Write a protein that binds this ligand. Sequence first.
Ligand SMILES: Nc1nc2[nH]ccc2c(=O)[nH]1
Length: 337
Amino acid sequence: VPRGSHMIVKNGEKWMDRYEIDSLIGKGSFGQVVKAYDRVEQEWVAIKIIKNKKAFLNQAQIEVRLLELMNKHDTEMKYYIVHLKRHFMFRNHLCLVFEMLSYNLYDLLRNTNFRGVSLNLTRKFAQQMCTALLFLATPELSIIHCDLKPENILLCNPKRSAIKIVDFGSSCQLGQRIYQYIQSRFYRSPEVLLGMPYDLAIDMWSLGCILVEMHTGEPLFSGANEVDQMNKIVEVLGIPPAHILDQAPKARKFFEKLPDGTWNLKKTKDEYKPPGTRKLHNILGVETGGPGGRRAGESGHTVADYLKFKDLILRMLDYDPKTRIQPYYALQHSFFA
Ligand SMILES: Nc1nc2[nH]ccc2c(=O)[nH]1
């Protein structure tokens, strides 16, 4: 019995007279992902190999149950979610066989030297992500991904705009509270930072953050820790509404209630732009040629196009999860007309 939790996988070995192991795609907390040729089906697959560790086996069983639930649906909207072909035990590890995709949206931004992709390509990603979130919001699914980020959105083909969401390992269904901290910090909603109840609206928050980053090349809210994160959110969006902070278990981690009942930022131990003064209108360069002025004298980047993009993003970054724009209504926005 091996001492380590990982599977030993040798490039070029063949599993079960079927899978020809090519190479390592990625390592993660869960285990590893290997590129393999399925000689039976004559196609590339990505095999996600789960560590022999109880916590990761449990996350992976949730992942399998949620992906299989999604597969029973007929709608074309299910094809924005990575397809689980099958799963098996091999050398005492749970192995999930996925369709093979191309590189992730972070890799795409790196290939721009972090100058961002066009507003036209951003629009195509936005429309597909809003469709994927509408699918997850189907009542019988009610799935919260809980870890949307550029690294978890993959292109199907390196020369095309089609994308899929991957990695439902941290996912849950509406009403569940499983993990103490959720979402990647730069993409983490205010309700999660505040220790408030969370629903599918946390994934729309993440999507808003992602789409700005895809066009500017830089994360909207690049916090070094939860306090720095909330402070970067407040630079752009102002102090959250009182009706939210008055109910937030962790309001006093970031804010302080003054004698008159109004909320301000908490005093530091002893630097940010004043609340609401880092305007998204200027981050996007709506009137000034887009990010860094670089989109002036290119088509598809008009002031009208930028106002529609800014307006949709600010509806996705509503502090109030009850009023934040829902996928069904985001798809009807004039940005997609
Ligand atoms: N390239 C690639 N394809 C994949 N499909 C499913 C997961 C995954 C991945 O991590 N990389």
